[PDB]
Amino acid sequence: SVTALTSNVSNKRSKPDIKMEPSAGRPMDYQVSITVIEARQLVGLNMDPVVCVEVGDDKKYTSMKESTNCPYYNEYFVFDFHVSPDVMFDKIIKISVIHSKNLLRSGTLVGSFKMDVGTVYSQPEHQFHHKWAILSDPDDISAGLKGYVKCDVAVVGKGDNIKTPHKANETDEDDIEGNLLLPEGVPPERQWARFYVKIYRAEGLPRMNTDLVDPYVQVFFAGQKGKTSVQKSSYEPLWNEQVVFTDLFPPLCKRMKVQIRDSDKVNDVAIGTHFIDLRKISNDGDKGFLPTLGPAWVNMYGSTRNYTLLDEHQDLNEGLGEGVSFRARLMLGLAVEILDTSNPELTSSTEVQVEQATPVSESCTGRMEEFFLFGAFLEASMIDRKNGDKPITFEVTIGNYGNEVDGMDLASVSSTPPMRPQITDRNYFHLPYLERKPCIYIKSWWPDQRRRLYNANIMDHIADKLEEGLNDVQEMIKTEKSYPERRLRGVLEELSCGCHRFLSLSDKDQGRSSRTRLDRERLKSCMRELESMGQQAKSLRAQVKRHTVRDKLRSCQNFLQKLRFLADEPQHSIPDVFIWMMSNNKRIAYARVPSKDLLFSIVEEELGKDCAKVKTLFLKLPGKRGFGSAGWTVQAKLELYLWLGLSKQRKDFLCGLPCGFEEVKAAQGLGLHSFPPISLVYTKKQAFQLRAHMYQARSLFAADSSGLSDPFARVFFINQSQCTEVLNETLCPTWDQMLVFDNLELYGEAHELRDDPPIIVIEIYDQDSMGKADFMGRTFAKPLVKMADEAYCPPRFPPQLEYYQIYRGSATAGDLLAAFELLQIGPSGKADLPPINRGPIMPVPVGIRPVLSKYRVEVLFWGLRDLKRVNLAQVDRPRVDIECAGKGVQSSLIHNYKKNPNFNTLVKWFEVDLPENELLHPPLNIRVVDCRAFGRYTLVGSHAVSSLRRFIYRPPDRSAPNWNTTGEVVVSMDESMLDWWSKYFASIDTMKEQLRQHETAKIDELKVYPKELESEFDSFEDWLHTFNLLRGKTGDDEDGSTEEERIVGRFKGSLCVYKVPLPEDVSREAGYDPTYGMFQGIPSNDPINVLVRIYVVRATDLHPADINGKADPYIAIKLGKTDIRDKENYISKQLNPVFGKSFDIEASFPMESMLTVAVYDWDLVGTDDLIGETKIDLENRFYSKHRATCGIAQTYSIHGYNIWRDPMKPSQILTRLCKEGKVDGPHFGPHGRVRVANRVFTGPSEIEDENGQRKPTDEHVALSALRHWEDIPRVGCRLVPEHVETRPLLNPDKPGIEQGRLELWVDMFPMDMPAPGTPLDISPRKPKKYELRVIVWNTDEVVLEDDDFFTGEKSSDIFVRGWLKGQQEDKQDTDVHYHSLTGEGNFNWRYLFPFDYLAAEEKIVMSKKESMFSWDETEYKIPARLTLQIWDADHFSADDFLGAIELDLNRFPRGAKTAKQCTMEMATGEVDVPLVSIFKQKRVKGWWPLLARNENDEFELTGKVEAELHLLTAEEAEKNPVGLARNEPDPLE
Ligand SMILES: CCCCCC(=O)OC[C@H](COP(=O)(O)OC[C@H](N)C(=O)O)OC(=O)CCCCC
Ligand SMILES: CCCCCC(=O)OC[C@H](COP(=O)(O)OC[C@H](N)C(=O)O)OC(=O)CCCCC
Ligand SMILES: [Ca+2]
Ligand SMILES: [Ca+2]
Ligand SMILES: [Ca+2]
Ligand SMILES: [Ca+2]
Ligand SMILES: [Ca+2]
Ligand SMILES: [Ca+2]
Ligand SMILES: [Ca+2]
Ligand SMILES: [Ca+2]
Ligand SMILES: [Ca+2]
Secondary structure, three states: OOOOOOOOOOOHHHOOOOOOOOOOOOOEEEEEEEEEEEEEOOOOOOOOEEEEEEEOOEEEEOOOOOOOOOOEEEEEEEEEEEEOHHHHHOOEEEEEEEEOOOOOOOOEEEEEEEEEHHHHHOOOOOEEEEEEEEEEOOOOOOOOEEEEEEEEEEEEEOOOOOOOOOOOOOOOOOOOHHHEOOOOOOOOOOEEEEEEEEEEEEEOOOOOOOOOOOEEEEEEEOOEEEEOOOOOOOOOOEEEEEEEEEEEEOOOOOEEEEEEEEOOOOOOEEEEEEEEEOOOOOEOOOOOEOOOEEEEEEEEEEOOOOOOOOOOOHHHHOOOOOOOEEEEEEEEEEEEEEOOOOOOOOOOOOOOEEEEOOOOOHHHHOOEEEEEEEEEEEEEEEEEHHHOOOOEEEEEEEOOEOOOOOOOOOOOEOEOOOEOOEEOOOOEEEOOOOOEEEEEEEEEEEEOOHHHHHHHHHHHHHHHHHHHHHHHHHHHHHOOOOOHHHHHHHHHHHHHHHHHHHHHHOOOOOOOOOOOHHHHHHHHHHHHHHHHHHHHHHHHHHOOOOOOHHHHHHHHHHHHHHHHHHOOOOOOOOOOEEEEEEEOOEEEEEEEEOOOOOEOOOOOOOOOOOOOEEEEEEEEOOHHHHOOOOOOOOOEEEEEEEEEEEHHHHHHOOOOOOEOEEEEOOHHHOOOOOOOOOEEEEOOEEEEEEEEEEEEEEOOOOOOOOOOOOEEEEEEEOOEEEEOOOOOOOOOOOOOEEEEEEEEEEEOEOOOOOOOOOOEEEEEEEEOOOOOEEEEEEEEEOOEEEOOOOOOOOOOOOOOOEEEEEEEOOEEEEEEEEEEEEEEOEOOEHHHOOOOOOOOOEOOOEOOEOOEEEEEEEEEEEEEEOOOOEOOEOOOOEEEEEEEOOEEEEOOOOOOOOOOOOOOOOEEEEEEEEEOOHHHOOOEEEEEEEEOHHHOEEEEEEEEEOOOOOOEOOOOOOOOHHHHOOOOEEEOOOOOOOOHHHHHHHHHHHHHHHHHHHHOOOOOOOEEEOOOOHHHOHHHOOOOEEEEEEOOOOOOOOOOOOOHHHEEEEEEEEEEEEEOOOOHHHHHHOOOEOOOEOOOOOOOOOOEEEEEEEEEEEEEOOOOOOOOOOOOEEEEEEEOOEEEEOHHHOOOOOOOOOOOEEEEEEEEEOOOOOEEEEEEEOOOOOOOEEEEEEEOOHHHHHHOOOOOOOOEOOOOOOOOOOOOOOOOOHHHHHHHHHHHOOOOOOEEOOOOEEEEOOEEEEOOOEEEOOOOOEEEOOHHHHHHHHHOHHHOOOOOOOOOEOEEEEEEOEEOOEOOOOOOEEEEEEEEEEOOOOOOOOOOOOOOOOOEEEEEEEEEEEEEOOOOOEEOOOOOOEEEEEEEEEEOOOOOOOOEEOOOEEEEOOOOEEEEEEEEEEEEEEOOOOEEEEEEEOOOOOOOEEEEEEEOEEEEEEEEOOOOOOOEEEEEEEEEOOOEEOOEOOOOOOOHHHOOOOOOOOEEOHHHHOEEEEEEEEEEEOOOOOEEEEEEEEEEEEEEEHHHHHHOOOOOEOOOOOOOO
16 A cells, blocks of 8 residues: 555654764774685796785785695684774775795785775675685786685674675686676776875864974875875965875775874874765766865864873874864865876886875865854753862854864854852752853854755755654554554655755755865765665655565665765865863863754755754763763753854844843943844743653663662753652662652743653662662653643543663663653643642552553473572572562472472462553563571572563464364485585585575485574474573673673573463363463473483684684583593694584483583693683473474485484384374374374385395385474474584673684483484595506707807706695606707606595695694695696706696696697686596596796796696505606606
């Protein structure tokens, strides 16, 4: 349907999202993982390439590969940072290839690739996978392609989740050009370009020497830097100097750091920093434009302008946080000229050149116009009392105008008169303005670029209305209001109407000649993009329905962020307005309002959102002091009227104020109606009464060491504060308290007071012993205003309770269920008000408090697991008190916790009045206490079940088609070296195909899960749930504890909440018994020994834990008392180990059920480092209805690779599942069929054993029934298949970032049942031994290297060098064919290359020490590549390299029949020669071209080699032996 709602349905407008901690400059743990896989087509002669990987300033190196232009590394690097996102995304990832690097000489560079971290982070999975970095010479614009480096680059923040692909076998002919390391839309060939950063002049610089300043401008771009000259002793410097960078276009480093700095001999320091975003000043595609900026001003912000010997906020001058003061304004320019690299006229140097720019006038930035800024401080409350009782001023400044202390007709009044604060409460002051509101007015002069601010105002007006609508949709989804899809269609209609309005509005004032090129280009880009946004919104409106509303709501966030991106004007016009609180002339706290928000326009859409309005500001501490413990308290709270505009437009600059004031003006302004006042004296005043219905809170912050709090809420309104009562030892208080703010005085008749009420600040505190209180959080509210003429009638009144999101810093700290109403005391006094019905404490009145219905809460008490020590004492007699809304039940005593942590009474219950609205249900508190002697109960831990919606019983859907249970439905269905790795790799390929299908048979398979097994079976919580007990104070979001180390135990059990008068037929269909209640089918609680068999397959992408960038992983398993540490079987120097292990641990379930599988880096000296660990919780797996004990294989077999692991046969599993589910069956008739309930399965009736005779069996059709157990009518359930799950490895020391992926699975077998056999042989495949024999027969047309000293005869002493594993382990040389005059050599020399080989990986396996000083042997896997080189032997100098070919033993070209048919096209990029594998044909003889790169970096034919490659196995080589060189057996001529 197309009908829609165009108005706000919910009350999200009354729940503001004010946060005192911004996201600007907040550091966060980041990790860049770069896997250098290989390189190809590297440009060099006999090069030993080393790939250097730099991220930021840290650089790491691969190992050196000898004499190859296509090296293979497969090396993993991890770079760790703790920086803000803007600093992080500006870091340069530089993947270089160098050679000849050693201990005192830096390497010669071959080629480099650059990008920044933000380009990788803007990818769909924050990563590139298997992409080729285009290397280029960074010092030569005329040089060509220097090679490619295949690599993975991934960026993760703390808490990000990446769908990382599994590393399968890489046996493919990979296309380099279709898989380049470039973002989408960047062309594969990138030109060179010059980035002219023209630096004209600066104004308004602060004091830096002690007292002049000597500024220069340093520009950073893509890792390069260049600076202008120093303009000594000038606050208005004039450079007219351009800094020219030579870099590739389009650049993958998309930000430029322009920074004015002061020149000192000792203390060269930053003044201000601006970042030019190249995304905002350019566009790609056909209708795009080159990056252009200016000539236009740019505003720089940073620390306070007063000079100190050391600066606390010097990081603000470097641009690392939000600037708290105006530093300077820099007149700026940017142009990009694409260089013609084929021209030999211009120089090919890439060095940063600082040249003289062409000077342009000041009138090019717009004519200077007079601007008038007016402020009216209506209210100044909530002032931090730690600043003292000294008098308080508020200084407003804009640029340097109004800065009478630090900055450098009408006289501007920039500060309020000083006024002593009065006490609101123990934490807060307020300034007693009352009727006398102090005012400020500032004259300033800025260039007239109001059109930029107007267009930004229209775009941000559309974005503001869009975000308000999407917040309305999200909130009314959360509160379950009817028809959320109708509101979203109205939001999209309103968005498309705003986008159409922008096109009609933004094309005014194009006749100004002061438009820059960027103004015209970004105007065209904004019109095009908002027209496409309007059409896309009209298209997305028709697709919004009931079931699709959440994903379309997600898709509208793209429109929102694109509007926020386009609304940011990169050419600054008017600097932001700063409001500073002062006492003893000390700058205490600041707010910063953008000047486009205050700008005045005739057009409503061009008008700023805060212009001519009373703006609620919250001042905050500058710099890092505004975060953490210091930034918790509200520094000040202002109701500041603000107006900015032209001085010609100030006729109506008082129109937004509340009416009923007299203007008191300065002495020079007497008798002038246009003169602004220095104060307003209000004569009208309206009496009001605020009712704070503080009913409840939930999920609050824990500010005591017991894990609880003593919360009371302090409600702030205007200058008054009132407290609720303190409720002890709870994180979900039911205060149930009405706070009445009597006879409030609202000065003046505020315009639209119903639609914009004054804000209410609610602060939660934990009461402590000595009168002090811990801050717990802060929410904001807006009251529902009743005017005097309004009736207190539905649907508006009485107000309903709603959840207000409490924030403690940036972290969420619970919800406050409250309602607020602001009732006007009318002409008839307080008799017009509604009546008011524990001492003087008033309850929340009827009609606002929730209507209560009776519920029964039944608790299953299953057990208590891993109860940690309290006060250094072991928990011995635990008891689980459960309390919900005052009522509750207590569990039976566990008389001895160690021998039996079971409850004697399984199911208890209690009755409690809960709200009829299930969204208003209070949380249920699980509390575990230890019963010491003499009634001394100490708290062990507590868990808060925040939502009971999961545990609410409703009668099940028996109208479902599965329940019908009647009518028959029929469901129908070399080799010897296959092992478990065959089915594993087949399942990996199948999982890859299913991941490709979700994005858009010879070998039996298992189910590889990309995540945990818990993620596919809702954590196995079908009947049994986990409730983590918590103790201790909740940690802060920076330098604090996470929730996991507050866990002091687990409570096992379930809940079942239902309304007390059940229907009798509903109760009987649920099978209600008096002993177990609603919990039917509960398994036995008795202890049972379980054999836990943990198969550890492999680990991928382990975090390095040694100084060499690798680790030595082994598996350490904890389960109960068993602590296996397999440090004898560590895999040395490997970050992607293949363990292939199994571990048998007998554990006493359900007590010893927390399984910890960890990976530890073995260290020779010192303790072994933890890499990561995972927790599996096998109890939920063991007792699940999903049968997560042993995985169910796809097919049944009794031999081979697909052998059935389970000691229970499929017929036994089917019989047990039918017996426990009370299903008739399994009825085996003939061996091919079985009937289970109404459903009939058919399949094969016979099974083959190891020797292949046939035997009739029921197991195939029983397994067919088990595979379709989900389709069973009564108790049908999806059984857990045979699987390999991928579990992330987590380190508590580096939280939030997954730093390994351990592929494993766990099989559990009860030991009262028959035991399983031996564990599966999942040990890694042994490499098949081979021997490659390479008979170098002859060489022809080898180039002549030597020149004779006497006659000048050209000759070569040709010998052939060959290896297969490497130069240092496998190299063999022929004897030298001395003095070849025509390039002909005769060798007949046989190489022998014995090697171990894995056929699936196509890798040669060898074991050798990494260095001569290394402790152990490391397993290496290289590609099978035979390298043949020709060399010239010299007696008195080094031998000279002549040419080489690298034959991949699976994909090398067929050798030519003669030497004349051998051409360069066999080895180069031509495809005309078919490829041949030596593992398939075993004998390839022919001629191959040997190539070398000349000084022009092109391949040339430097020789040909006749060779015979003969691949045999080792067993064939022993029975038919030959000798090395020409020796016996089988001698050569
Ligand atoms: C003197 C030569 C110093 C050479 C440099 C250096 O500090 O080496 C530390 C080495 C190796 O320790 P790790 O691999 O854990 O450090 C690596 C770390 N986990 C990381 O990955 O950052 O330890 C010792 O020498 C024994 C210390 C304890 C002795 C009781
Ligand atoms: C036993 C007495 C102390 C013996 C100390 C000793 O010599 O250890 C050998 C180590 C090398 O051993 P690994 O790198 O395999 O470290 C093993 C494992 N990967 C680990 O993490 O520790 O030598 C150096 O660190 C010096 C290199 C100098 C190069 C110039
Ligand atoms: Ca200086
Ligand atoms: Ca406390
Ligand atoms: Ca306390
Ligand atoms: Ca280590
Ligand atoms: Ca180690
Ligand atoms: Ca260590
Ligand atoms: Ca020579
Ligand atoms: Ca020679
Ligand atoms: Ca030589």
